[PDB]
Design a binder for this molecule. Structure first.
Ligand SMILES: NC(=O)C[C@H](N)C(=O)N1CCC(Nc2ccc3cn(S(=O)(=O)c4ccc(O)cc4O)cc3c2)CC1
Ligand SMILES: NC(=O)C[C@H](N)C(=O)N1CCC(Nc2ccc3cn(S(=O)(=O)c4ccc(O)cc4O)cc3c2)CC1
Lengths: 337, 337
C-alpha cells in the first residue's frame, strides 16, 4: 500500500457507509481482540475515506491551503497504515500487537488536527472574508469533519485502552462527581488568574428514584470536556461582571434524570449576553488556552445523540444545558456520511 | 372595484414591498388622520396582495380546499373594500369616517382566519398525511401567513383606536403588571378546572437601574397573549404532575432589562418534557380553548424582532423565555415578502 494508489483506496472504501455503534455494542467489544481488530481494519478505512472524500469537495481556494493539505496528508498516511493489515492473520498475536501500535501512531499523528484546521479558518477570514454564507459553509463542513474525527478517536481509544471501566466508557458514571472534578479544575485556574472563584452548588433531580444518586453509561472524559469548558465561561462571566461588587454568586448545576433525557444545567449570574450574540458563540469563524471550546463541546454532546444549548437573560446571566440520552440503547454514534 | 378585476388588482399591488414600521413610526402616526388614511389606503392593499400572492403558490391540493378558498375570498373582498377609497378626498371627513367604518368591517370579517386555516391543516393531515416535509412546508407558510395577518391587524387597530396610550401601544408598559394580569386570569381558570393553582413569584433585574421598575414601549395586549398562553401551560404542567403530591411549587417569573434585550422567563416544576418533543409544541401540524397557542404566541414575539423559546429539564420542569427588544428603535415589524 503506497501513496501512488491512495486515490483508488479512498474511492473504494468511500463506497461503504460508516457503521454507527451504540453504547452496548461498545460494551460488548470490550468485554474479543481478534474481533475488534477484524472490525476496525475495515471500519477505520471506511471512516477515514468517507471524510477524505468530503474534504475533496471543498472549493479549490480551500483545498489548496497548507492547513488542509497537511491534514489530508495525515489521513492518507493513516489509511495506508491500516491497509497493511488487510491481508494479515488475526490468529497471530504479533499482528494484533502491531495493530495496536499502529493505532497509537495514528492517534498521535492526528493530535493537532483542530489547531491546524483552525489556522485554515483564520486564513480564510483574512483572504476571502467572514460573510454569512461563508460562515454557514464552514460550520457545516467543520461540524461534520470534527464529529467524524471524534468517532475515529473513540474507536481507537476503545481498542488501545482495552487490549493493552470499559476503555473510555464508564458503565456507572456518577454524573455529579464528573461535575465536581471539572469545577475543581476550573476553580484552580480561576483562582490563579482572578484570585477568587465562585462556589459550586449541585442539585440532583432523580425523577423516578428521588433518593438515588444519578449514574449513567457514558464516556466521562467527554463529559468532563463539556463541563470544564462550560465552567470556564461561567466563572469568567461571574468574576469579570462582579469586579465592582463584593460577593461572587455561586455557579449552580442541576442534574436531572428523566425517562429519556439526562440533563445538566449550569446557571451563572455573569450578566448574560443579548440573544443576537448567542449563535456566534458556536461559530468556528466568529470564535476565530484551556478547554476544547464551545463549538467542539457541542459536538461531543451530539456524538451520542445529545445536545448542548445556551440561553441567556441579558443583564442577569446564562443557563448552559447538556442534554444526554439517559438510556444506553439510545446512545448511538452520530456519524456524517 | 369588482371581483372581476381582482387578479389584476392583486398583481398590481403585489409588485410593491410592504413597509415595515418601527414603534416610533407608530407613535408618530398616533400623536394625522388624513396622513394615516393616505398611508393605509396604499399599504393595506400592498400587504393584502403580497400574502394573497403567496397563497396562490400553494399546491392545488391545498388551494382547492374549502378553508383556503373561504379565506382567499375574505382577503379579496377586503382589498376591494379599501380600493374604493383610492380616488376619494382626504379633506372630506365623511371619507375618513367611512374609512374607519370599512376597517372595522374588514377586521371583523377576518376574525375567524386562524380556526379556518386550522381546519385546513386538520384536513391535510387526514387527506395526505403528517410527514416531516409536509410539516416543514406548512410551518413555513403559516408562520408567514399568520405574521402577515398580525401586522394587518396592528395597522387597523392603530387607526380605529386612535381616530375614534397610543392605540394598542403603551409607551410606558409596566411589564410586571402585565405578567400579574395574565397570571390572575390563568389562575381563575386553573382554580375552576383543577380546584387549586400555583402561586406566582416575580423578580425584576433592572441591570442598569437596580431600583427602578421595568417599563418599555410595547403592545400590552400582545404581551398578555404570550404570557397567558405560557401561564396556562406552566399551570397545567404544575398541577397535573403534582396530583399525588401535597404542595404546588410556585411559578417563578424573572423580568430582566438589559442593554438590548428585555427578557421574561417563566420557570415551572411541572416535570418537563424530553428534548425530542419540544419542537412539536411549535408545530401547526403536530398541535393539530383559552389562549392563542404556542406557535402563534411565538409569532407575536417575532413580530417586533423578539422571540419565544422553550427549554426543559425532563423530570424537573420547563423554562419559557420571551425575548423582546428593549429599545423601541429596534422594535420593527417583521414582515414576510
Ligand atoms: N470592563 C469590564 O470588563 C468590566 C465591566 N464593568 C463588566 O462588568 N463586564 C464587561 C466584561 C464581561 N466579561 C465576560 C466574560 C465572559 C462571559 C461569558 N458570558 S456568556 O456569554 O453569558 C456565557 C457563555 C457560555 C457559557 O457557558 C456561560 C456564559 O455565561 C458573559 C461574559 C462576560 C462582564 C461584564
Ligand atoms: N396520568 C397523569 O396524568 C398523572 C401522572 N402521574 C403525571 O404525573 N403526569 C402525566 C401528565 C402530565 N401533564 C402535563 C400537562 C401539560 C404539560 C406542559 N409541560 S411542558 O411541555 O414542559 C411545557 C410547555 C410549555 C410551557 O410554556 C411550559 C411547560 O412546562 C409538561 C406537561 C405535562 C404531567 C405528569
Amino acid at each position: 500500500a503506497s501513496l501512488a494508489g491512495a486515490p483508488k483506496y479512498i474511492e473504494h472504501f468511500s463506497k461503504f457507509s460508516p457503521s454507527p455503534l451504540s453504547m452496548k455494542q461498545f460494551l460488548d467489544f470490550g468485554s474479543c481482540e481478534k474481533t475488534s481488530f477484524t472490525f476496525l481494519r475495515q471500519e477505520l478505512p471506511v471512516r477515514l475515506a468517507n471524510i477524505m472524500k468530503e474534504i475533496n469537495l471543498l472549493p479549490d481556494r480551500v483545498l489548496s491551503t497548507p492547513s488542509v493539505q497537511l491534514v489530508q496528508s495525515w489521513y492518507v498516511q493513516s489509511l495506508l497504515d491500516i491497509m497493511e493489515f488487510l491481508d494479515k492473520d488475526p490468529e497471530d498475536h504479533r499482528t494484533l500487537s502491531q495493530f495496536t501500535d499502529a493505532l497509537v501512531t495514528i492517534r498521535n499523528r492526528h493530535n493537532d488536527v483542530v489547531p491546524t484546521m483552525a489556522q485554515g479558518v483564520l486564513e480564510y477570514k483574512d483572504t476571502y472574508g467572514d460573510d454569512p454564507v461563508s460562515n454557514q459553509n464552514i460550520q457545516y463542513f467543520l461540524d461534520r469533519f470534527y464529529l467524524s474525527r471524534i468517532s475515529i478517536r473513540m474507536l481507537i481509544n476503545q481498542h488501545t485502552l482495552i487490549f493493552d471501566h470499559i476503555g473510555s466508557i464508564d458503565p456507572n458514571c456518577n454524573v455529579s462527581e464528573v461535575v465536581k472534578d471539572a469545577y475543581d479544575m476550573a476553580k484552580l485556574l480561576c483562582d490563579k488568574y482572578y484570585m477568587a472563584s465562585p462556589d459550586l452548588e449541585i442539585q440532583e433531580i432523580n425523577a423516578a428514584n428521588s433518593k438515588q444518586p444519578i449514574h449513567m453509561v457514558y464516556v466521562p472524559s467527554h463529559l468532563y470536556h463539556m463541563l470544564f469548558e462550560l465552567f470556564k465561561n461561567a466563572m469568567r462571566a461571574t468574576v469579570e461582571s462582579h469586579e465592582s461588587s463584593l460577593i461572587l454568586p455561586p455557579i449552580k448545576v442541576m442534574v436531572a434524570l428523566g425517562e429519556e433525557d439526562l440533563s445538566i444545567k449550569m446557571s451563572d449570574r455573569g450578566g448574560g449576553v443579548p440573544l443576537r450574540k448567542i449563535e456566534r458563540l458556536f461559530s468556528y469563524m466568529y470564535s476565530t488556552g484551556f478547554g476544547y471550546g464551545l463549538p467542539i463541546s457541542r459536538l461531543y454532546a451530539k456524538y451520542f445523540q445529545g445536545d448542548l444549548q445556551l440561553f441567556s437573560m441579558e443583564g442577569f446571566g446564562t443557563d448552559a444545558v447538556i442534554y444526554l440520552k439517559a438510556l444506553s440503547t439510545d446512545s448511538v454514534e452520530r456519524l456524517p456520511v
